[PDB]
Design a protein around this ligand. Structure first.
Ligand SMILES: Nc1ncnc2c1ncn2[C@@H]1O[C@H](COP(=O)(O)OP(=O)(O)O)[C@@H](O)[C@H]1O
Lengths: 48, 447, 34
């Protein structure tokens, strides 16, 4: 069914992925930054 | 792609009762074998199970218990268990019996300050307040000129108002050096003014100025709010005897002079009781009568033991917990008289005694385990079994006290956990009260 | 230029459900394109 969606879409949707154009612009560095929630946060979160 | 995690500060410090989190009772009020940090003491914990329902019932006044039993049997740990079992809102007032020997107030009255601190009170205080940037400020004159009113123009994000206020507020604004552009807060009940510095609108107006600047206040200039105050009857009693409220030259200066205690008159506690009864009648107040814990009670003076007869028979008094580690002592201040727990037989009727008792080796091992995992340390079973043996040789406190010193020795020696080779060294470095008394009796010619 | 992106999340709260649904959706959302 994915191949049916692709064969429907191919004649009327264009596609890229940036690396097919952007030979000289950066990829994102992406940071999942965790945080320790505070005392007032733990007190209200636990009460909820 | 990347992950990051952060923390930047120390923990709470560990302390001698910090493993105790409650009495470890079941729904029937029976004691679990090991729960909430405590183990053993099932009779004393079941008894304290009645007492935590005694406190929470509120009906009773001046009921008292005496925890009695040898050194290290957990008496002050059980009063700490009660303090945790009641939670934060019911006041628990810790006291040590030797705190009555003040140099500012009579021994017979330090007790009343402690009693009155143990009756808590929750008040829905409505405070009504003015706040804003001061956009205009003018006093209005009258013949002996005197000031009759002040006009203050105040501004907030929600608008502006221009208020007639009392000359005591003007005297407060002058005291606080308030000027146009200052953000201020005034509460009309206290007549009390707080300056917060010039509004952020003025933060560009000089290249170099002493001021902190604040964002313009929000909501209307005049507004009222509840503060749900927690307060105690002592905190009402003292606050009237050396008054720091109001705004006059006298109250402004009672706030500077040395804060000496004073023998609060029985009449003031009378007029305070009338005022808090009116706040309870008005539904503004809830009383929360709590606990006074006189630890080491065996050394109150006989003056104090005889005062406790009047205090424990008061219709107002909190519930009281005493503790004693003592046998048939002489009663302090008498020189002649000896009695159980060091407490007069006259007072020893007025208390439900909770007998607290010595430990089996199994309970010592189990406390030492629960204690080791509270001090944050890993200990091998052969080393913990060896501390159980040191418990049978000496005392529970010495056996507990070796744990952290053994963990320092272990991490110096490069191990992750206490091995028996560490405890067997710490036992040689640090004597206990029994083993030191042997060398100190043998060498008694030279001390 | 170089680009850096940060997400701020609280462990064990509710935002990890949002991140888990976001990961589950992002995996479904890849295969329908490439
Ligand atoms: N039943 C118990 N369960 C857990 N810890 C206890 C227990 N009994 C005593 N302790 C702990 O052992 C030590 C001695 O008890 P403590 O209350 O200080 O004795 P005392 O009544 O003589 O003042 C303290 O560290 C205390 O927290």
């Amino acid at each position: 069914q994915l191949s049916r969606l692709h064969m429907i879409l191919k004649p009327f949707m264009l596609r890229r992925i940036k690396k097919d154009v952007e030979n000289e612009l950066s990829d994102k560095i992406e940071i999942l930054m965790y945080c320790q929630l505070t005392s007032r946060q733990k007190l209200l979160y636990q009460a909820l | 792609k990347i992950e990051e995690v952060k923390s930047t500060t120390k923990t709470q410090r560990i302390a001698s009762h910090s493993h105790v989190k409650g009495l470890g009772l079941d729904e029937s009020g029976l004691a679990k074998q090991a729960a909430s940090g405590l183990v053993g003491q099932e009779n004393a914990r079941e008894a304290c199970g009645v007492i935590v329902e005694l406190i929470k019932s509120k009906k009773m006044a001046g009921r008292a218990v005496l925890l009695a039993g040898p050194p290290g049997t957990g008496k002050t740990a059980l009063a700490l268990a009660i303090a945790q079992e009641l939670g934060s809102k019911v006041p628990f007032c810790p006291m040590v019996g030797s705190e009555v020997y003040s140099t500012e107030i009579k021994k017979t009255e330090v007790l009343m300050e402690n009693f009155r601190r143990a009756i808590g009170l929750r008040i829905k205080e409505t405070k009504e307040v003015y706040e804003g940037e001061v956009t205009e400020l003018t006093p209005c004159e009258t013949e002996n000129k005197t000031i009759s009113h002040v006009i203050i123009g105040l501004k907030t994000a929600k608008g502006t108002k221009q208020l007639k206020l009392d000359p005591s507020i003007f005297e407060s604004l002058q005291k606080e050096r308030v000027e146009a552009g200052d953000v201020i807060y005034i509460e009309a009940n206290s007549g009390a003014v707080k300056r917060q510095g010039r509004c952020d609108t003025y933060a560009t107006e000089f290249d170099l100025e002493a001021e902190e600047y604040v964002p313009l206040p929000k909501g209307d200039v005049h507004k009222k709010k509840e503060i749900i105050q927690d307060v105690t009857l002592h905190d009402l009693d003292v606050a009237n005897a050396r008054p720091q409220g109001g705004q006059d030259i006298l109250s402004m200066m009672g706030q500077l002079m040395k804060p000496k205690k004073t023998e609060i008159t029985d009449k003031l506690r009378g007029e305070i009781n009338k005022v808090v009864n009116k706040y309870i009648d008005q539904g503004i107040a809830e009383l929360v009568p709590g606990v006074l814990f006189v630890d080491e009670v065996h050394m109150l003076d006989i003056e104090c033991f005889t005062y406790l007869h009047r205090a424990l028979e008061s219709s107002i008094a909190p519930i009281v917990i005493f503790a004693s580690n003592r046998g048939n002592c002489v009663i302090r201040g008498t020189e002649d008289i000896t009695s159980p727990h060091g407490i007069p037989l006259d007072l020893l009727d007025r208390v439900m005694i909770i007998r607290t008792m010595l430990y089996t080796p199994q309970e010592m091992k189990q406390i030492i385990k629960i204690r080791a995992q509270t001090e944050g340390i890993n200990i091998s079973e052969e080393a913990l079994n060896h501390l159980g043996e040191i418990g049978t040789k000496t005392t529970l406190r010495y056996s507990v006290q070796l744990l952290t010193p053994a963990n320092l020795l272990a991490k110096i020696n490069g191990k992750d956990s206490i091995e028996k080779e560490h405890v067997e060294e710490i036992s040689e470095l640090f004597y206990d009260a029994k083993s030191s008394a042997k060398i100190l009796a043998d060498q008694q010619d030279k001390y | 230029k170089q680009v850096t992106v940060y997400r701020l999340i609280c462990k064990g709260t509710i935002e990890e459900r949002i991140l888990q649904r976001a990961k589950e959706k992002s995996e479904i959302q890849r295969m329908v394109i490439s």
